[PDB]
Amino acid sequence: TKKVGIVDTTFARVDMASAAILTLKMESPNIKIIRKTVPGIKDLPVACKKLLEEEGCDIVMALGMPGKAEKDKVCAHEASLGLMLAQLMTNKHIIEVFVHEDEAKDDAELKILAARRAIEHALNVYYLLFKPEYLTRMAGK
Amino acid sequence: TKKVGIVDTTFARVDMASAAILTLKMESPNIKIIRKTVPGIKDLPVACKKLLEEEGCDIVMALGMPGKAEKDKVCAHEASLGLMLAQLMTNKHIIEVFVHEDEAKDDAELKILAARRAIEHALNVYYLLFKPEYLTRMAGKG
Amino acid sequence: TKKVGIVDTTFARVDMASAAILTLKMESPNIKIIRKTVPGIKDLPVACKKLLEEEGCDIVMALGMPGKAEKDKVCAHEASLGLMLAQLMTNKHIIEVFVHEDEAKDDAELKILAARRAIEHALNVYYLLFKPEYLTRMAGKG
Amino acid sequence: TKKVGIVDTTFARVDMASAAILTLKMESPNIKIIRKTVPGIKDLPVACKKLLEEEGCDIVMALGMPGKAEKDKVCAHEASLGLMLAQLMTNKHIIEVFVHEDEAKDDAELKILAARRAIEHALNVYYLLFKPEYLTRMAGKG
Amino acid sequence: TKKVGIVDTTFARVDMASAAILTLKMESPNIKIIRKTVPGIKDLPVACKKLLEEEGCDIVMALGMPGKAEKDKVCAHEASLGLMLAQLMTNKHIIEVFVHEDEAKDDAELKILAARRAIEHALNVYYLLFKPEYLTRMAGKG
Amino acid sequence: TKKVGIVDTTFARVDMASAAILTLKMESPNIKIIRKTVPGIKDLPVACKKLLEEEGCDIVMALGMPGKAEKDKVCAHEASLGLMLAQLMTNKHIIEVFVHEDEAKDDAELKILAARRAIEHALNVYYLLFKPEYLTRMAGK
């Protein structure tokens, strides 16, 4: 009865969507899923907004991986405000799942880190959709 | 007859909501209260806006605790503009209660600081809701 | 009341109808009875169906006596399917009372066997019409 | 709810209905059961059809026990086509549960065999009614 | 725009459906498939008919594997007429895919034979649905 | 047909419901029966009244077993007036079947006494429902 949109990119170097999809289907047996892939992180905001407005998603996960340069840093900041603005226009959450490449020490770690961050955030969506009170408890923690 | 929304997070390391709730109930015997908790500080703006628009809150307290890194600094700046934009879209105050972790020298101080900032801001809400004149009087004070 | 049709033949070598008629009148004195006689066993199915559909019978007894040859065997098989098909078209039982001539060792036995089979099937009709529960009980034995 | 019809006979030498009834009530507590007993195996097809059409059964179990002679063999074949025809007229399954007397080596075995076949088929009804996917899995299964 | 129903059993000892499904999807990519599994071969006719009448299938493949005994032989004959009758009631083809166990010399052959039959018949469905003429051209073909 | 309500308790130490039910089914081939069990004897009056008013019973049997103390004696008196008041509000008989524990000399007697009293009263219901004249003929006993 609840619909989630997942927006990811071709730019990213780890597939983050599959693990998030698996998590939510595991948590909810029948929750509806819709996927759109865009080229880059700056293409995320509108794709996210269309999924909320034109595909009737209750919530969206926006998945991206900023590069290492101080210019990819600016791209992600730009992309993050976009995500916030899309949320405020539609009165709906977009959970931003950005894994910067600078956070891992090799590729094995980055595959690990991106998959884990995706999964947990997928769990966060579950709670936001179904069990807000549980979220309320974790306050402070 | 007046309702307040309080939005906090699981990310924060001190429970800021309980003390703010206690403060307002203490100042106003019957003021209503509604709580939503979100995961992070970037999830604050929309939750705040929905409480103002869909739960009929007159005002909201947005409670968060930015981390220490220059990246949590950017997250909070992002979250602060969001809060401002949510206020301008709805013609309603959101009192931002952000306690950066860099402001305290240990955890004992941070628990203290966050609770105190929350309480005071809770008092500020009371005045904004009920006693603006006191505020006008106080303009130009520490 | 309950109406029973009885269809028999001129081919048969023992009158099976009289004993079946006597049985049912004995068990249910006011029962309505209607009789049609056809030449052969292959003429049984339609006569049976018309009695069910056009004479308002609740049930029919179809009485016949297949001969001895492997060709009368085929005639009876043909006649039996016909009986089943007539039942399925009308949602009504036809109790098939076929006494093959091969089952008795002389004519005295065949007169005896045909009359007895007719009577007991006549009793089965009464149960089907009036007392299904008794039938339900007899499922075990035989 | 879901409704099942069970049709058995007085001819049969083992009560097959009780075990099938017990199985289904065990599998699903809610299910409705309706029973009709007929004299013989050739009386099964119409009783089955009436239960499907006039008593609103979703499915029927047709329980019978053909005798040993090559003439009871013909009766069962006749009765089996009837069952198939009743199914095709009503767009509803009739699960045929026939236990020939030739399949057991004494009466103890026949009581055992008939009861077991009935139970399993009762389980098959459950799946057909409630869990067709499980059935799909067993494809190519022994 | 074209729909096919596939009905198979749990009785069968080789999964015939997967290969038929794969064949048809390979020949046509805009073809809809619906599957129902029944316990036995005698349950095939009504499942086939419901798929044609209630699930809007243009055609059905009926897949089964008769056993070895002269009694499974009778079951399949019964099941084949049923299939023909279901076709004549609905003005729609049911392609019968029966692989008797007697046709293979071991299990490896039977897996092979059943899969191959299934596939070819799946190709026959394609032609019946889309390419009637190719079929016409095969008249008199070995 | 005619419907009878039977109200009994968990407090009682002998099942009296089985004894009458059997009696009435024996006397009447198809008379209907409805049962409600309440905890105590003070819960009998309203259950009895609801059966008369909301379940369409023509008559009710109220079955109970007062204990031995002078306080169970008061409970039963309270319960008996209740029964009478329920009868007067609905213009329908409630046959009171109370077996005090003080009336039997051991448990074997009490099982016997309670079952017999129940049965006889069940016979009295039959007559009240079907054969009043037989009561009148038995003017003197």
Added chain:
Amino acid sequence: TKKVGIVDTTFARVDMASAAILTLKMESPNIKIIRKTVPGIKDLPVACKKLLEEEGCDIVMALGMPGKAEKDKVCAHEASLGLMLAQLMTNKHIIEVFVHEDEAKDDAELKILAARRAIEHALNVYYLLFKPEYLTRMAGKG
């Protein structure tokens, strides 16, 4: 879906309501509870009746503790008839929970006895509301 009224007194020397409330919430997660406290046991009947009639309670627990004198004995008798009359006027159960002070040998016992009687009766309410059949089963139970 269900609703219960609990009426107690200030006269009583043990709080009986809390344990009864805890019991019912434990057995039914979602049950609605409404409480009224009156001064004495003679004030119980009307408070009970108003809860049944004006607050839409399905059932009421009437909790009281008669004193020791032969005059409190008369008060409780008076109060018990009142309870019965309130039940007969509204066609709804009032479970009387009276714990006389004479039943315990000290105050520790009386706290124990009153709390236990309250809880047991709270369980009786659960059954009356949700599971009458259990009660029916325990007929003749000690």
Added chain:
Amino acid sequence: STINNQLKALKVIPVIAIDNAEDIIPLGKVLAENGLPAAEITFRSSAAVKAIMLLRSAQPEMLIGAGTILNGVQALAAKEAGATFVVSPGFNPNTVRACQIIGIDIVPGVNNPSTVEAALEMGLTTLKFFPAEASGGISMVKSLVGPYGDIRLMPTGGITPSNIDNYLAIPQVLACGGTWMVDKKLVTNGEWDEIARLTREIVEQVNP
């Protein structure tokens, strides 16, 4: 089927007329320990119901029937007390119907062909033949079982050790009812040794 088998094994059923219900306890002990774990307790005395209840408690595996059952009310009393079958001196189809409805088996008394046919028509086949001697004895028994191959009889009335063998020699006779080993006089006088002797003697006689 269970009752028939138990009767066939016992061959003799004590028919008991008790005055004081308490007396059933020592009586039952003596019967059971001397090889005769059966009793038909007659509804003549007010205490028979209590006697059945006491006996069932004291001798749980005893075959206990109630006799002189003239109506369904008494049949119910007997069932609730713990009897597993009832017996009537004659055949009253109203009583038989009532027993069917309340759910206890009845073995009704007959003494002529017409009453046998009445019982058969109600589905009964195990019948008491009473009063056995006064109705013509073994000659009568042979005349009933002859035409009616399905019946099985329990002759009672005037049966003694001197004539019981003749009745038991008839295949369709299951057992005979006898009062002599439990005569009220013996019970009233506490002649337990004599009751034990009569019981052992008859058990040895019929089941040698």
Added chain:
Amino acid sequence: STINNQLKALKVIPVIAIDNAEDIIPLGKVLAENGLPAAEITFRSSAAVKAIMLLRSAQPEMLIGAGTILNGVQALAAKEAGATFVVSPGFNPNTVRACQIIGIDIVPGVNNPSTVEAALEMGLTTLKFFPAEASGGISMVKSLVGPYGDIRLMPTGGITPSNIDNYLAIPQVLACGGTWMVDKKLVTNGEWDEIARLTREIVEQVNP
């Protein structure tokens, strides 16, 4: 209540794994005539069903249970064959519910406090304690019966004449299941004299 009483009297229940169903006839004869008229026939194979049927025909008064009952279908097979109770090695509430619905008593296996509580919650009090030795033996039994005053146990698994007395000394133990006197090896080899000896010996040991 009947089963509890029979177990308490028997004290030892033969747990039988039969290969050829026909073998149940001489086995049952030897058990019954040596004082042990009871048998739990394990559903190792579909063949046992026949064993229960043959045994019930041959020894009508024998206490016959079916063991290794893992589902309601098997419980039904056992009921139809003539068993009067079923036993499972562990506790499956789905099996217990199925037995309640089909109407046969079940004595399920437990071996720890949590499983005992699960059984109690479903209204069961007679439980099999299995595997008895491997789960901690008498020390474990004492730990279960201690907190749970309502339970009655049938320890099975590793019970032998050398340790059975210790189990029977616990008041809440009704009887123990044992395979040693009916070991498949003895049956397969037709060692009827040995089976008779083991049976007499254990009967004398537990019921001196």
Added chain:
Amino acid sequence: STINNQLKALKVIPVIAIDNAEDIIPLGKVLAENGLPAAEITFRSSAAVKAIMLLRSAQPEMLIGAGTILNGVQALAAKEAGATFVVSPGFNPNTVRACQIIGIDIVPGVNNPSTVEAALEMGLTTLKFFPAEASGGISMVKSLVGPYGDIRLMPTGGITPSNIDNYLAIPQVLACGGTWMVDKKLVTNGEWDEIARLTREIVEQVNP
């Protein structure tokens, strides 16, 4: 987790089976003045509750739990009497909820990996390990705490001064339950000095 801190300090919790509730007063006095201000009062007698009420009045700062709590009704009785937590021999999720609903702390018993996982799933981390010796002792304890880093255990069952040190040496063991210093025999016989001696001795042993 307040309970955890008190248990960690005490290291040994007297598990009390009282016959006469009044006996809890001198028993509690002896426990408290000898350095062991804790008691788990088992619901093995109707009296235990009165015992909790008397003990809470007499020794207000005593840590008082109720044991053998099999259902929410008993948990409520214990709460109303003044216990601050309940304990059960095994793990019944129905009991655990009920305790959550009525608002009292429950430390349920477990003895294997599956039951631990069941408890963890309901948000519990402090668990009783029972029966400790009969379930495999320290070897079993090490096998549970190993995979489950979040659990904290209270081993009970067969704990004595000769084996308690081995259990306490495991970091995730908070305290052990023991009956030996409050054995019913000692209480029944008014052996107060010995109880005092056993209590002083164990306190010195575990908290040297």
Added chain:
Amino acid sequence: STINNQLKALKVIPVIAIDNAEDIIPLGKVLAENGLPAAEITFRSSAAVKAIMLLRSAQPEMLIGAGTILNGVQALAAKEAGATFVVSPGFNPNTVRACQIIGIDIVPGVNNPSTVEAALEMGLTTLKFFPAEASGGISMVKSLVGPYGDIRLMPTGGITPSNIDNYLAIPQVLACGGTWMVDKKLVTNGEWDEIARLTREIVEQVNP
């Protein structure tokens, strides 16, 4: 059954608790070149996920499972890292359900009849038997496989070269899990020569 066939061939599965994930590379090299190309990597730490990823890269044909899997999130982490099955110390049907949904095989731990039946009911037949020695060892294993002909076991917990043969002698035992040849102490100390010898020794022992 692919999972089984590999286990049946290996007979012994190293159960690995790694501190530094990098250590899995030399450890896996030593295991594989000494004839034991299998590893169950326990989720003691986050290091486990990286260890599975490194091992799968370094030893692509290695049988790699993840152990101590308590929930579906961890099962997913293990699947994404490259494990082909997960193992849990006990049986949590919620975990089993999650593994079915995310699509990875689970071999859950059991140690008694009830938990076996719970697993069978969810369609599982290959089960870990844990903790093997502390739960009663080979005597317990024989008691489980006996009633449950469909199960296949992987005993783990206290398995050593001195007792593994006894477990492997049971037909329904596929393989045993063992830590001794990969003990953290040996890995921490870089005792690669000793790990190799232990690995060679056990391979020779079980697959002579």
Added chain:
Amino acid sequence: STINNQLKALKVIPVIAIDNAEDIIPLGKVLAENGLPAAEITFRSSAAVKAIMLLRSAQPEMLIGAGTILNGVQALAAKEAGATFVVSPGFNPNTVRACQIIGIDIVPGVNNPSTVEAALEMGLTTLKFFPAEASGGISMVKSLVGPYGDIRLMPTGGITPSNIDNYLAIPQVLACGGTWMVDKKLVTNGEWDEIARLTREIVEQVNP
């Protein structure tokens, strides 16, 4: 990716034309035990489907492909028989499309630049180069791999021990197909020793 790695390791793939399917069993045994656990079974005859099925049963870990696959029907037959890839002598995009739909990998044959580009456009990179010698041999191979850096080749046709090294010396050549060690003449004549010799010799030659 798996197939590429297996080919790179093997370096030579037996291309088998079998007359009697049964012959695949001894042939596969000889190939596998002499170090060459791979086979491409050509659909030269109807007998091959059975050959793939028999070989997969007899040598489960063998790399088994089907050759001479001219259409999707044959590709399906091969998949159902147990082959994990198919090979075609030339490139038919309709066949490639069908293989994608039925879900089996195909390695199609090419012998010129245009056909390579056709394959690349359909997403294929591992291609058979056939007939290798008749199409220009190593000079042709060098001309294809030169412009097309992504392709990897399996040259087949006229490959012998005298020329295979020259092909394998080209980095983009994964392996070559060869019939000489499995020539039908040798199989027909049961020359198993010679097949074993040819197999050992080529394995030593390419993987020294």
